[PDB]
Amino acid sequence: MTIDLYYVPGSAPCRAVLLTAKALNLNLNLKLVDLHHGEQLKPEYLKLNPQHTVPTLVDDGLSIWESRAIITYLVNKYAKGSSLYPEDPKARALVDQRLYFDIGTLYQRFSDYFYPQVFAGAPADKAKNEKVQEALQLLDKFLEGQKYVAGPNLTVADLSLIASVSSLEASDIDFKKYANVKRWYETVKSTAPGYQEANEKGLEAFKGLVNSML
Amino acid sequence: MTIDLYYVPGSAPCRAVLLTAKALNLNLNLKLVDLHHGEQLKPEYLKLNPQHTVPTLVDDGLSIWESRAIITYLVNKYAKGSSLYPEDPKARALVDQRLYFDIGTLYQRFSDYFYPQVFAGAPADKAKNEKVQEALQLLDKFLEGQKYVAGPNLTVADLSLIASVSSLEASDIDFKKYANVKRWYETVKSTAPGYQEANEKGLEAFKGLVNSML
């Protein structure tokens, strides 16, 4: 009957799913994983997810762990036809495009820039910084004349992207200097159901982990 | 009436789309882009794709450039209900999961390992090599007891992943040492319509670029 979500609150991809669940008003069985002490590396977790990451969604026989597949799965399953993931091909392709931009470009660049500094005491690399700036410039363009990032309505693309973009507040990347990004950030904060609990709470935990490590 | 695809044949994400088009028996208007001399950086191309990448699909008012959004778009548009991208949520989520694995893990790791060597004369990094091995080990697990990577039928996930995995033949990563990967590779080669033209031809061009640069 019930569906399990293995997660930690600090993790942006996890927050993408928490946001999507709030937007659909779902009741997932949240299962905190002790990443800090390698619970994800034990056989019982590998059974569910051999890539030993979070989040991992477990829906009876189905285990899936890419946040961006989970959020579209939740809509496809529970709210087929929702404006959060519209069925119109052109409209859907734009959402999908933004999701791939998120994983392959924005969050990847941020990850490349930031996590060496946090977990390997690396210095801040100017070139990697610039790659993040360019990702934000692209986002700022996507948002020119647009309320949301993939069409006129809030979509799973906004929720995934905001979970990523918000994580930048733990670093020295001033993303609010991009006017359209700043506008969109505020809009999504005030329109995504349960944002405080689904994203802001976890974001705070992430800032906590970051401070501790730095 | 007609739909444009800006591409170069050597590019794995481009080959993912060429494969998907062959599998759907579509007639795209192929438009070769002169990446080698920076045609993608000129204003006319930026207009279509500010991220200045290939492929870029242009369908009247719609421009989209993430290969993995394009291939699902082609199915959603022209063959809704196709086994190449099944509508069943669980079945679709598995395909989507594999697509995100492809961009965020397998191809990302390969890119990280290989392109510094090809375009920046970097030495081969053992650690980055190992990250690619681990991506292949994950693929090999996904394929345990399975003909295809995301269910019983050929899907856009196989086509995107094979475009990536095949690119490894230009490097020193022996992916065929993974028995399930080797089996799947062969199956897809012999079952994806137009594989020779959509993937192998371009793969050859890529090997050409690689040799030239090395």
Side-chain angles (χ1 to χ4, degrees):
Chain A
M1 306 282 68
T2 321
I3 287 191
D4 300 337
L5 186 74
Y6 298 84
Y7 83 115
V8 290
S11 145
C14 287
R15 291 183 267 113
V17 179
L18 295 167
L19 287 166
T20 297
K22 288 295 187 175
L24 295 172
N25 188 29
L26 306 187
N27 178 13
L28 303 171
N29 180 34
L30 299 183
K31 299 186 81 187
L32 192 63
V33 348
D34 192 1
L35 282 187
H36 184 49
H37 303 101
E39 170 189 355
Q40 74 279 14
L41 304 172
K42 298 189 198 305
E44 278 286 310
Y45 197 91
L46 298 169
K47 179 173 181 294
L48 299 182
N49 180 353
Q51 196 160 352
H52 58 81
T53 58
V54 290
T56 308
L57 188 280
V58 182
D59 186 358
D60 300 349
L62 185 81
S63 171
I64 59 174
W65 56 91
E66 291 286 341
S67 57
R68 297 164 190 87
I70 293 168
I71 66 190
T72 63
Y73 172 71
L74 295 176
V75 181
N76 291 339
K77 186 175 186 196
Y78 291 106
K80 170 192 169 302
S82 167
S83 65
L84 293 158
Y85 194 49
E87 295 182 291
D88 173 79
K90 289 190 203 301
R92 180 157 298 197
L94 183 56
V95 176
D96 290 331
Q97 170 170 358
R98 300 300 191 237
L99 290 170
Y100 287 102
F101 168 76
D102 182 38
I103 189 170
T105 301
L106 198 135
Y107 187 81
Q108 184 63 61
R109 287 173 180 201
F110 170 70
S111 179
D112 287 348
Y113 171 65
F114 197 47
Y115 293 142
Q117 310 182 54
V118 185
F119 300 103
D125 182 287
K126 177 65 163 73
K128 293 171 186 305
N129 185 298
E130 284 307 316
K131 287 247 161 281
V132 178
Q133 304 295 342
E134 301 169 355
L136 284 167
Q137 287 154 24
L138 289 170
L139 180 49
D140 192 69
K141 226 302 195 281
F142 302 157
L143 286 171
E144 180 70 36
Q146 302 278 319
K147 192 182 211 292
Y148 293 107
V149 82
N153 315 305
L154 182 82
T155 68
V156 289
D158 300 288
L159 303 181
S160 182
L161 271 165
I162 200 159
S164 299
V165 175
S166 68
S167 313
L168 272 55
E169 296 186 358
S171 71
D172 69 350
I173 300 297
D174 182 17
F175 58 91
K176 285 182 179 184
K177 68 175 170 168
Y178 301 94
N180 299 328
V181 175
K182 181 182 175 161
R183 173 179 46 73
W184 164 86
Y185 197 58
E186 180 184 19
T187 300
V188 172
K189 279 164 138 189
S190 322
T191 54
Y195 186 95
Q196 171 64 32
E197 166 158 273
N199 195 63
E200 196 67 33
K201 184 175 178 180
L203 180 54
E204 194 61 30
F206 177 68
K207 289 171 183 182
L209 203 199
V210 170
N211 290 330
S212 187
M213 288 279 189
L214 302 176
Chain B
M1 306 282 68
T2 321
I3 287 191
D4 300 337
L5 186 74
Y6 298 84
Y7 83 115
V8 290
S11 145
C14 287
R15 291 183 267 113
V17 179
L18 295 167
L19 287 166
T20 297
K22 288 295 187 175
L24 295 172
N25 188 29
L26 306 187
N27 178 13
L28 303 171
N29 180 34
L30 299 183
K31 299 186 81 187
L32 192 63
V33 348
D34 192 1
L35 282 187
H36 184 49
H37 303 101
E39 170 189 355
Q40 74 279 14
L41 304 172
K42 298 189 198 305
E44 278 286 310
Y45 197 91
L46 298 169
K47 179 173 181 294
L48 299 182
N49 180 353
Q51 196 160 352
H52 58 81
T53 58
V54 290
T56 308
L57 188 280
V58 182
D59 186 358
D60 300 349
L62 185 81
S63 171
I64 59 174
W65 56 91
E66 291 286 341
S67 57
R68 297 164 190 87
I70 293 168
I71 66 190
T72 63
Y73 172 71
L74 295 176
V75 181
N76 291 339
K77 186 175 186 196
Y78 291 106
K80 170 192 169 302
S82 167
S83 65
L84 293 158
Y85 194 49
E87 295 182 291
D88 173 79
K90 289 190 203 301
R92 180 157 298 197
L94 183 56
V95 176
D96 290 331
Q97 170 170 358
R98 300 300 191 237
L99 290 170
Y100 287 102
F101 168 76
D102 182 38
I103 189 170
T105 301
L106 198 135
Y107 187 81
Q108 184 63 61
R109 287 173 180 201
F110 170 70
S111 179
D112 287 348
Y113 171 65
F114 197 47
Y115 293 142
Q117 310 182 54
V118 185
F119 300 103
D125 182 287
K126 177 65 163 73
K128 293 171 186 305
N129 185 298
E130 284 307 316
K131 287 247 161 281
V132 178
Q133 304 295 342
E134 301 169 355
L136 284 167
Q137 287 154 24
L138 289 170
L139 180 49
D140 192 69
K141 226 302 195 281
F142 302 157
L143 286 171
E144 180 70 36
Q146 302 278 319
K147 192 182 211 292
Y148 293 107
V149 82
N153 315 305
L154 182 82
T155 68
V156 289
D158 300 288
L159 303 181
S160 182
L161 271 165
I162 200 159
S164 299
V165 175
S166 68
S167 313
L168 272 55
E169 296 186 358
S171 71
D172 69 350
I173 300 297
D174 182 17
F175 58 91
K176 285 182 179 184
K177 68 175 170 168
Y178 301 94
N180 299 328
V181 175
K182 181 182 175 161
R183 173 179 46 73
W184 164 86
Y185 197 58
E186 180 184 19
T187 300
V188 172
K189 279 164 138 189
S190 322
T191 54
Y195 186 95
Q196 171 64 32
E197 166 158 273
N199 195 63
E200 196 67 33
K201 184 175 178 180
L203 180 54
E204 194 61 30
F206 177 68
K207 289 171 183 182
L209 203 199
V210 170
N211 290 330
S212 187
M213 288 279 189
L214 302 176

